[PDB]
Amino acid sequence: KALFEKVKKFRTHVEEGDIVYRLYMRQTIIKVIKFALIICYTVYYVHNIKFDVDCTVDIESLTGYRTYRCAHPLATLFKILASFYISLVIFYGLICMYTLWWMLRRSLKKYSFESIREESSYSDIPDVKNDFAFMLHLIDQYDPLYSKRFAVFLSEVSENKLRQLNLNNEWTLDKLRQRLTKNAQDKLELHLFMLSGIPDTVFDLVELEVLKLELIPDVTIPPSIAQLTGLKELWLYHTAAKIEAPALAFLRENLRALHIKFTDIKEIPLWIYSLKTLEELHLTGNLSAENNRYIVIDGLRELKRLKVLRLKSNLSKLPQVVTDVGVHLQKLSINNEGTKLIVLNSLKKMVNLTELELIRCDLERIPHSIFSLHNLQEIDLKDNNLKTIEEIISFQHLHRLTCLKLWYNHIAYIPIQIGNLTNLERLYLNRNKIEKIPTQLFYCRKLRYLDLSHNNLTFLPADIGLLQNLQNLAVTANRIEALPPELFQCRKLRALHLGNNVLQSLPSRVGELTNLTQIELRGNRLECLPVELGECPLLKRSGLVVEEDLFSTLPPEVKERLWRADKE
Amino acid sequence: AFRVLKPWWDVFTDYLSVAMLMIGVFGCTLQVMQDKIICLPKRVEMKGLKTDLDLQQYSFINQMCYERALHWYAKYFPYLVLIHTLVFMLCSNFWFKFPGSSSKIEHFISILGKCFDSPWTTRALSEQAKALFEKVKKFRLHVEEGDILYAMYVRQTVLKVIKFLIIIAYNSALVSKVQFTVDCNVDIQDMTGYKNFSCNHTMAHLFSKLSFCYLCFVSIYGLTCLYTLYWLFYRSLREYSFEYVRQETGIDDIPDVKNDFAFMLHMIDQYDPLYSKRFAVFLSEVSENKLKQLNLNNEWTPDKLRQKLQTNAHNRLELPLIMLSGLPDTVFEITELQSLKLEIIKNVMIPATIAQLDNLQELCLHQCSVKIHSAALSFLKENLKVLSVKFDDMRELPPWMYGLRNLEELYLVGSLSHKNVTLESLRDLKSLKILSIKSNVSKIPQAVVDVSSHLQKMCVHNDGTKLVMLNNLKKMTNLTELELVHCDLERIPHAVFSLLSLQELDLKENNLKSIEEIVSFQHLRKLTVLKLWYNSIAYIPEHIKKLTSLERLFFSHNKVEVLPSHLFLCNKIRYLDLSYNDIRFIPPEIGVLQSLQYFSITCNKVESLPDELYFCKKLKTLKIGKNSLSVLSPKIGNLLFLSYLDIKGNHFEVLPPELGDCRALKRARLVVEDALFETLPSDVREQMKADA
Amino acid sequence: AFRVLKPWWDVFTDYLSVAMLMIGVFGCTLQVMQDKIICLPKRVEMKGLKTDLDLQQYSFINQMCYERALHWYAKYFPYLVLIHTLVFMLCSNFWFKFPGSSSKIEHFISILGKCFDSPWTTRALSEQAKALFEKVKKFRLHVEEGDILYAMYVRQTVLKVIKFLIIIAYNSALVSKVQFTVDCNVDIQDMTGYKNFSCNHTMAHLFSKLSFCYLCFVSIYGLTCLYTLYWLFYRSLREYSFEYVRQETGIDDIPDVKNDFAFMLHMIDQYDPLYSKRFAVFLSEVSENKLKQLNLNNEW
């Protein structure tokens, strides 16, 4: 890895330069021209070295003589030396001309580098620029193999493989074992997030039940995923991952749920339609397209075993393929999260549907097609800006109408037609502006759970004793200052969320709440806690949400038993 | 050590010096072997011209004319060149043969080579290096004070230039003086019979050519010297400014250097432009922070954090920090901590990893300059509910703490006024309910009025400063409990009278004496708690009877000499603190205090207690203290609810056994002398100590 | 071992000795090859002055007059320079060539290198060296009982200064004796018929200037030796108190050193003050206690 780092550093440093090439070219030019000059003038002047010379220095006042014949013994020897030296010069000049001609013909400012990568299929061996190609060519002149021995370290594939090896070395099965967690679904989860690649060791922990992937760059599933028997649900967040055929075959029968969170359409692998045991599918992100919307998801029809469906895509039209595949869907969830959706009457064709959730779809009204779903039992229409809900009378059609949610809306009044809807067992209409509770609401005696918090309600009708099946009610952030005695007539009331109201005093009949497990009184304008609150069998400090000062009004024995049950 | 200090001109000068040494030695050798003068007399079909002389006479004449006629510089040219080359070599090596500065040079070479050799520099630019960091700092502390090396190099270059100039200037004139031939008219006549002599020595013209070549070499030498000196007299090497490392790596450190470091760095850059880049990393402060953080993260273990994990004061899982240089990411792996305490930790940068600390509501900072990331700031804005901050000179205060809209409780320990409070606007603290400030604030800030629309409890406990402006405290509409300590007020303010929602009231260390404004405290019909701690109070008005809402009373450490009867009129008072006062007698009206559950008169002159004091059957805490009591009544056996009793330091003789009739009272809850407790029976003392 | 025992003046004296040795060799070579005395009878249109003498007579006259007339100092001067330079080199090397003190010198060099090489010294000033502490204390038990090394070095310095003084003293008087010309009267008459002879040898003036340069070098050597000897008898090298490690590092240990140890520390400080500082770490009792505490916390 440090070698790769130094390779990148050196490529940045020297690939630009083109300095050593220029200096060597200048030196070669100097050598060639100097050889030419000496081979010229030395051979010009070679003849002057002669054994016998004739000199007339004209010294007669000292000698009397004028002319002299003289002998230089080494002149033949110096002629031999000159011939030998100039032959050496000819050899040097031939070598230098060979070098310069080869350099000019070569054009070695860019290393071709394509033969080696073509032969070894190492496509990541780019041609390097000057001051790197020249030296590469020189080393090839010394030894071609040394080029390849460096080429593999300019190979990005090799660098990625080395990094993957280091990734596998780093991970220990124990760290993944401690990294295995339990979700809210009691499923062993190993969520891999911002991880470069797959370490195959994760395939040894077959106990993995849910795999969640986020910000993992385009990995490919190796066949060893076949060792992960317990995987049933999958979560992939923003990954255009690939797969292998054995992996696809294993997931074709060993996958139960799939969840995808994509920013772009391509982040969905196309082999998803080949998984035939998929039952729950979750998709997050804008899949909206123009003139080809709901066409990329056309393969859902191939997902015969698809039952559950969660959508978070800000859609405005119901997909055609989703409508066609809804024949075997038992639950459909859409979260347009602001975008208004038009059913186009295409929601009734999924008669097998049992649950339906449309949160923040800005419906503003109930289309009739919802009532056509005879198997529908629960329904949530949160943040659809619902002001008038008098259409509930058509809910007489649904004989298995178990629950309903219309919270986070503009509902300020309760239509009486809900009295027809006796099949209801739960209701949640909080975050609204409801001010009164009609007696007719108490005609749905099957009601068991309620959450009417954050409303203008200021009283509780005496007909609460009618709703004996009720066990949980929330009225937080309301104007409640009085509690009817009939509130205590439901002896099976388990837990209550009554905090943050204007309740002056709590009636002593709280002791009648024998099944009272959890109670919220924080924010109430209470002064003294009733002593009968301390006689409830299932009361605990955890189930007692109330301020300490108001709680201190309770008898000390009540406090001691509360703390003892807290420790036990 | 011996190669990295040599620029190109140094190498070229060294080569020229070697060539000049060869020239001088070869000239000396030729002078030794072949340099001889042949002499003949000058003045006189051709025939011989014999002068009838022998060979020894020839030799003597040659010696004499060589000594006389031959030019001295011509004879000494080889020695001259050798001497000058020796001087050049000696002065060129003397820079590194000078041990006093050569030690610094060698240390610089070692540190530069080690720093360039360190891979951590390459890692950071993208183990023991940290320890190596130490040496670098040591070096930059000791060697920046030098620069004598630079002056020495300047002196050496100047001397070399002067030598070259002199050599050229005089040898140019002296070269023409020599000739192949020569003549001498010495008084060899009458010793040989001849005076005029024509002579010559062979090596003359060859020496001339060699000298011309040597002078050209010295000319090139001087040109190199001039280039070097120009580069020395044009760049001002006294300071080296990087201005590229800061731009590239974004590290504003490595600001500059002294003269010596600049000289060495310039020489390194001339030798190689990248070794300086690799060397300056260990001088970088931010790189040093990166190395320290990495080493600390590797050294730290989450197990030690789990062990040091504890509960804070406000029952939250706290992870105190006492001395750290940064944030261990392992701390971010501990998501279960409900509190976090930082003490004396400067230069704190919180990344987005605070999102891991999901279950966090209280943060304790003690003398820490803490900066966040926008992601960390957002996570704290939506998750931080309690905050504890200690600052000393306001330099550790993070501005973003004023942007927390989910913050509920705030703790400050640090002066603001340093006369107005230097407080930023408390506008974004949209959930601030509790505010406790420890400062020396002079006037109450307007910023808290920006938060009083939902603020519930504001407290300022100064170190004795006198609170001047009471206008803002009148605006505390949503205030519920007010605590003012040591505010040097000396009088009851008009602002509290404008705070009707007050349920608790504190006037500790305010040194009040005349407290007759309880009529204006009847303006607070919710005044359940009112404190008058550490005051000069000695007088209780009748009108205190009008506060039926009173449920807790504090009058400890006051000048109250006699307590009045009307003081007992507020029956709803459950807590009574009359300790550390001048109270000697307890009026019997205390009998009406049936609901009174606390009564402390510790360190008073209490000499007797009426029986009606025992009529307070709900008294679960009784603290008489070191008073002047002499006897204890049996009636205290009727206090079946008494849990804590303190009568230590009194003059009791025998304690009545009826003390054992107090079921909730134990030996731990009873403060008596050894002899006092010994007066209790064996069964009573055993029941108080154990279950017998 | 062979490098850090040389202060700046020691290296200067080494260079001076090398120059003097080379000059003596050059003079000896010149004497061997070319040094010859030429002699002619002195007492006597201008023509030749033949004295009807042969070459054998020429050589014999040259021999006899060179043996007689030329100063013995002049003839032995290259040899004298060579001898004195050889004595200087021998006494320079003998300080380390005597095994009895050379063993202590080698042990000191090795222990100083090992101690300064230990990075725990830098750790304290900010592994196995703990055991090396024993050698340190063992070393402080052994060489501090010496100081005869100091006496030997003082003897060497005194002898070198004495040699320089004697060389200057008699060479100054002898320098003016050499002359280019000379005369000799021997009973070569009735052997050759002549008695008076004027003679000269070529080397004379060149050797005179050579002697001038040699005497200048001897003067420089004397100045260097004088500086060394003066420093020996001014700073009182028999005791060395650091007064810097104790003040800087805050360690009240390292009380003092003995004569030999003080002399060694003085010489090292002359070479480099910092090596002595890094070696003083292991003489520090506080540091040694800290290292023992660190080792004990590791081992426990």
Author numbering:
A (entry chain D): 241 to 808
B (entry chain E): 16 to 59, 95 to 176, 236 to 527, 531 to 804
C (entry chain F): 16 to 59, 95 to 176, 236 to 409
Direct quotes from the study:
Because the binding of Sb1 rigidifies the LRRDs of the four A subunits in the observed conformation, thereby restricting the accessible space of the corresponding domains of the two LRRC8C subunits, we continued to characterize structures of LRRC8A/C in the absence of the sybody. In the 3D reconstruction generated from this dataset, we find a consecutive arrangement of four well-defined subunits that are organized as tightly interacting pairs and two less well-defined subunits. In the latter, additional density at the level of the LRRDs can be attributed to the subunit occupying the C1 position, suggesting that the absence of Sb1 would allow for a better integration of the C subunits in the hexameric protein. The described movements of the LRRDs of the four A subunits have expanded the accessible space for the respective regions of the adjacent C subunits, as manifested in the emergence of density of the LRRD of the subunit in the C1 position and of the CSD of the less-well-defined C2 position. Remarkably, the relative orientation of the LRRD in the C1 position is distinct from the conformations observed for the A subunits. It instead resembles the arrangement in the LRRC8C heptamer, except for a rigid body rotation by 17° away from the pore axis around a pivot that is located at the interface to the PD. Considering the observed symmetry mismatch, the incorporation of C subunits and potentially also other LRRC8 homologs into heteromeric channels would perturb the tight interactions found in A homomers and thus destabilize the closed state and improve the activation properties.
These membrane proteins consist of heteromeric assemblies of LRRC8 subunits, whose compositions determine permeation properties. VRACs are composed of proteins belonging to the conserved LRRC8 family, whose expression is restricted to chordates. This family contains five members in humans, termed LRRC8A–E. All of them share a close sequence relationship and consist of an N-terminal pore domain (PD) followed by a cytoplasmic leucine-rich repeat domain (LRRD). In these assemblies, LRRC8A (or SWELL1) constitutes an obligatory subunit, which is essential for the targeting of channels to the plasma membrane.
